[PDB]
Symmetry: D4
Subunit: 161 residues, 8 copies
Amino acid sequence: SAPVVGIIMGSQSDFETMRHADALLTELEIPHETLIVSAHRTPDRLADYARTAAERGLNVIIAGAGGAAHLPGMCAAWTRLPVLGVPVESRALKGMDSLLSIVQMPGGVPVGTLAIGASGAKNAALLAASILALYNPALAARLETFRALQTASVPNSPITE
Amino acid sequence: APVVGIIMGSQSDFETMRHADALLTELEIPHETLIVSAHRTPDRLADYARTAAERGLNVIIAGAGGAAHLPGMCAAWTRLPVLGVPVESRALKGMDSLLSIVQMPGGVPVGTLAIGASGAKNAALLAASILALYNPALAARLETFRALQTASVPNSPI
Amino acid sequence: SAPVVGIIMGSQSDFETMRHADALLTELEIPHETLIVSAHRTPDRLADYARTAAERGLNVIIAGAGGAAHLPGMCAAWTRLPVLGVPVESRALKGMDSLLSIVQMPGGVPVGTLAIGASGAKNAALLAASILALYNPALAARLETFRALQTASVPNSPITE
Amino acid sequence: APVVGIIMGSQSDFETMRHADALLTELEIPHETLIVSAHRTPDRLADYARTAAERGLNVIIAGAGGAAHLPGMCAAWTRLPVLGVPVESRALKGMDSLLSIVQMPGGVPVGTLAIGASGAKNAALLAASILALYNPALAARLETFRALQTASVPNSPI
Amino acid sequence: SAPVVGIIMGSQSDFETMRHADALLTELEIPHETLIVSAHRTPDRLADYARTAAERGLNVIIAGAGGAAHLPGMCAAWTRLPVLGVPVESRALKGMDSLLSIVQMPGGVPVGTLAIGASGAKNAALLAASILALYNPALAARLETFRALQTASVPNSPITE
Amino acid sequence: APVVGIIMGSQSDFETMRHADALLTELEIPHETLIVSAHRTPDRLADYARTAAERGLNVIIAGAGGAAHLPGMCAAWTRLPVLGVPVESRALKGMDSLLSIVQMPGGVPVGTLAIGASGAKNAALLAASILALYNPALAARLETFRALQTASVPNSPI
Amino acid sequence: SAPVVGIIMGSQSDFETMRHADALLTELEIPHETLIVSAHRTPDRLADYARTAAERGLNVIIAGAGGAAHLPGMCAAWTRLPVLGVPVESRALKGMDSLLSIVQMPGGVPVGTLAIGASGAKNAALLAASILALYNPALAARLETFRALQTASVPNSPITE
Amino acid sequence: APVVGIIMGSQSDFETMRHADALLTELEIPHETLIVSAHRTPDRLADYARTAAERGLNVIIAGAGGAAHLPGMCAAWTRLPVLGVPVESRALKGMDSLLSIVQMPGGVPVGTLAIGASGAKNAALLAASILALYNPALAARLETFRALQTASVPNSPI
Ligand SMILES: [Cl-]
Ligand SMILES: [Cl-]
Ligand SMILES: [Cl-]
Ligand SMILES: [Cl-]
């Protein structure tokens, strides 16, 4: 059970957001690694991580960062793997800086970007699951089950109290 | 048979989404390029998304502007990876497009790319990266593309 | 007393906002239904709800959603009834994403959009009431009374304490 | 006799609001199209809004740009449904227009449509949807409009 | 001592902000009235207030409002007096809607706009004082004294604790 | 002798501030129209503001773009009412101009007008409203201006 | 040990942010002064401070301000020294007004601008240190040590609890 | 031998960054002007930044648009002062450029200048101010530049 998804983030504070991606991959039984890699404080670690990801058997990278969020884009610069980016909510600008720093990649090097915050982290895991489900029928079935339960769990009317 | 579907809300969107179409062709990825409007052809959208997987599609690239609902509603109906391209709007220059695509609630993802032509090109490349996981010949072509992209950058401005 | 307005929202969390529309329709004695319909998690429910609304006797739909708020627009895609949209305030972007996702409908499919949050929900009910009052003299009188009391309730000067 | 009033703050606004005028005509909805400035003709505005219902108007469509006060002040004076169209401003591209119209406090509503020509067209359609509740012939024409809009969308970009 | 400045606001909730203008005019000994006038709920009151302001001896109007803030602009539509506008901070959009709704008046009808919130209210009073000081030497002296004390009150270095 | 000073940071600002100049002339208000740069001529600015009152100026209208510091720094040095006009900037379309002028901390006010030509025209009118408090002939001309502005608004778009 | 960096700010409230610059210069053993200078309330103090800075032996000025933040720009107008600007987070607009007021200096008079808030203050000190390290080998060594420790302090994986 | 390096992500960026190049030349500061793409030539970037100090560079000026990562990634690899110029982007007019450069977390600074040509010119001037600390001849030329800039401002608009 070698990892097929890598979850990386710039700092421990990012884990409050990125833990939601970690949890969801575990629930879908997707082998993964969850690591801290700082674009700005460990740039050589980042370069090494990204340029060896494919040969290590990783299939998808989920990268989370806030503020001037460069981790997902610089990861994608160094790997042909799909890289998904999660904008971590920032204090002053509430993730608008995080979002624009990740999604506005110029043509040539993509980052598939999800919503600001916890929703984006969960959706990055689900998008990674969708990608892997293309080749893995068991996982495809688990993902379709997840989506069916999601749909069946929506009540018909709200609770008033 | 197409493995990527490129869909967009209107003819005018094609000025942007043609960059995705061109890139898929350059990488020799079989694809279909179609107009599907979330707001004006919602039943067409529902049928398209619902049947995508059984038709053999692997990735959907969806472009729209303004209150851009096409990628999110497509993802609501398929388990396939859906990639969203915010088309530049007249007034708000794609900021409305961008927020209405990227800010999907948890449970139904859309992988969102940059506003405009860059995003369309990158959606095609991201689709290619996804398909390359399973297809060694395509993976080689994608690596060639990235190598040429890197090698072609000049060292000084003219 | 079959419903003539439908209030729909994507989630239970939306009801904290949309309850203000519910309450106001009740105070104006407008028969209505209040339901959860998720654009993203129950898309078939949404399609069915919208395309049968008119034949069921509904006259106005009030739809609330937050973030990438697609519920009001997709409702309007499937019905000729007037659809009013309430942007629910979002955590990071404070409803700016909700607002733009609802109001910026391209030409052909309208959503009449109200303010972000509780004010917008109350005003959606009042706008629905204004629409229905065009054909219902009793309700027209109740609405004019509401507006008169509103005006008469404004004091001449503020309280200092 | 008009059942919809289209009003706008200035002649230049008509480049936008003419799309509402055209649509009402296409659907054969009797209407009046007028200039009423909140800031420059406030008494004209007060009289217009105050007398709208007794004149037989059912819906008011109001377009304005910048610090756009026309729709809100109109709604302050009438119990009729008032629909607001943010006109694209030079500097802020209608973001000022949009916020000054949509963010009405509770008690006095304005149903707000998109910035620019799309919003003007949609205000007319929303007015038509309102009037169709009571008018079977108009409801049929509106359903025809929506059916043609849906059916006319091509399947592939040229 | 008839009022020479009128402070008006849309609601009691606005007074938390506008009280700072009230207090400052009192400290500068400027006779004033402080009233609630709602653009949207008391439009006839507003029209009457603005169109009689000059003949009543008012010289400056300070108007505060939030959200779709129409009070200052509609006041200025009806009076030749200088009208100063204070954007009241709003819940979702933090006064950005208030600010744009007030400052972006088209050419022909001005509103002199101050900062969002308490700072803007204090500055509206000071700007009104500056206007009145043009014709009132006593007040000019009080205002120059205020500004001198303000300047003299700035310490040379911060306190660390 | 001038009773209003119009100042601006650069020649290019005059494309905007000329509208203030024209309006003051139309209302026959004696004024001076000058270039004063906060960033490039800070000593010129300090002397201008410091001496304004003793020179007989009653109002200063200051226009600037980008990180627009001219109105605020002028108000720092004079007790005269200072009115600020955000000049439209190339990239951010005057949003930077607007925030850097209007968001003055308490203690030193700048009465801020709209971004661009509208704001320049309105700064002149606001200056006129201030001066009309003391000058009956000017008050009459201003009332004539407002009456003509109101009366000139057409009733229907062409 | 005469100061070679001046840290200035408009108010005591700014020190909650600017103290981070003060602390960092002390830790890097860079002699500095930390002062309050208000652009709007002490404009003559500001002019004098900036135009004498170079002759006093200062090499870098770090200036912090919020809202309509004019202190860094007006400082740079009066000195040829490099001036670094720190946008202090504002209440309503969360430092967006601070940021734009500082960074958008027209061509001719630069302000090197750092992030909104505490991060920007720490980085202003580090940027000042980088500038001074060009001529000071001891400080260059201390700065390289700071950066090495920073890098070595990043863990490989997050803590889950 | 260059003491300032001007780098930018692409040829199109040079329309902006040429203003920095021109200014350094005007002040006779030896420099190199190069294309280095964070996203397309990340190894070129790493080598450039890592070796900058030992090559004798004192300041790096880096310009980029969109998700602008070039200045921050450069600062990650060098202890030299790095100055960042947000290049105006097509859709968001450099607001994305600006936020992705200025909002660096604590520990790795980038001194950020205005969006566009103004920022490029100011990055060169800020680099000059830094170098003038150590170089009396350059300090004199910079003071001459600032004196001419101040003295050249006209007193009235034409
Ligand atoms: Cl089409
Ligand atoms: Cl007109
Ligand atoms: Cl000039
Ligand atoms: Cl290139």
